[PDB]
Amino acid sequence: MAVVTMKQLLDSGAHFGHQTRRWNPKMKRFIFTDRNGIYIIDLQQTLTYIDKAYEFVKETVAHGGTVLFVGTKKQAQESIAEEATRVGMPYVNQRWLGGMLTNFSTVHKRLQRLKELEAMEQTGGFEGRTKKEILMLTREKNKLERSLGGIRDMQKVPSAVWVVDTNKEHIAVGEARKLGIPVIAILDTNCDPDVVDYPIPGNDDAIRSAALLTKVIASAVAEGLQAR
């Protein structure tokens, strides 16, 4: 079962991959052909694996669970932010700090610092805070927001992750597979299916495709919530 299909999928350009000289030949299971020097992806496999991952995220969220959206790539980051802001789920789209989920104690302590600074802002304490103090702490708040702002309310150690461009975000994949978390991911030709559990073999270098895949995963988690 899929909310979308080949037509409204390849309207974007998800069927594309990368050139024939940058690819993991584990992808052969998902290769369709080679055209214009790039490989083309088996969208039937993408549909059945979309169904797999949809059922996965649905049952996890219904049992009580959370997905971390990670799309630091420029091609996807704004869409990732949009869907994650809509559904109200944790996300990062600017940078992955090494240790977000495996040094989560420390990263959560710095989230507590962010909330302390936001309570400071609520108090509007500006007169006891000198000028360089105000400016350096605003810069620090902006750093903490750019990095962790998408997960202000996390305190989870979550149950799933949603990756764009494993090659770009190999740190999150390693942290997940080290801590025992499942990762759904957009598998392009340059990616590795051995690390991804419930993949989604689309394009990562295409903004429309990444937005579309984030949208269907967003809808899946929304229905997993509505099933509560």
Partner RNA sequence: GGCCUGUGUGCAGGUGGUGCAUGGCUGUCGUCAGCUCGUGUCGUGAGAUGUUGGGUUAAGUCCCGCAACGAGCGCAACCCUUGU
Report residue 135 CA to chain centroid gap: 31
117-124 LR contacts (CB < 8 Å, sep 24+): 117/141, 117/144
Q: Indicate whether 22 belongs to the interface with RNA (CB under 7 A).
A: no
Give the residue carrying structure tokens 């990616």.
Answer: 191
For the bound state, the minimum distance from the C-beta of residue 9 to RNA, rounded and expressed in Å, comes to 30
- Count Cβ atoms below 10 Å from residue 126 Cβ, excluding itself: 12
The reply on whether position 128 binds RNA by CB under 7 A is no
Stretch that binds RNA, among 60-68, 74-82, 119-127, 173-181 (CB under 7 A): 173-181
Of residues 51 and 121, the one with the C-beta less far from RNA = 121
Q: Which stretch binds RNA (CB under 7 A): 3-11, 29-37, 107-115, 188-196?
A: 107-115
Nearer to RNA, 3 or 136 (CB): 136
Among 55, 117, 145, 174, binds RNA (CB under 7 A): 174
For residue 127 the two structure tokens come to: 């007169």
Q: What are phi and psi of 17, to 5 degrees?
A: -130, -145
- Select 20 or 142, whichever has its Cβ closest to RNA: 142
Q: What is the DSSP letter of 200?
A: E
Contacts for 78 with CB less than 8 Å, ≥ 6 apart: 93
Shorter beta-carbon distance to RNA: residue 38 or 144: 144
Of 50 and 144, nearer to RNA (C-beta) is 144
Query: Contact, 107 vs 148, CB < 8 A?
Result: yes
DSSP 202: -
Q: How far is the CB of 78 from RNA (least distance, A)?
A: 16
| By CB under 7 A, residue 112 contacts RNA | no
Count interface residues toward RNA (CB under 7 A). Answer: 22
Given the rule CB under 7 A, which of 4-12, 76-84, 134-142, 186-194 is the region that contacts RNA? Answer: 134-142
Q: Copy the structure tokens of residue 210.
A: 């990444």
Instruction: Give the CA distances from residue 112 to residues 107, 109, 169, 207, in Å, rounded to whole numbers and listed in that order.
Output: 9, 5, 25, 34
Tell which residue, 143, 154, 193, has the closest CA to residue 68.
154
x/- letters, 56..95, toward RNA (CB under 7 A): ---------------------------------------x
Contacts to RNA from residues 138-157, by CB under 7 A: 139-140, 143-144, 147
142's CB contacts (< 8 A; 6+ apart) are none
Binding-site ranges for RNA (CB under 7 A): 95-99, 102-103, 105-107, 109-110, 136, 139-140, 143-144, 147, 171, 174-175, 178
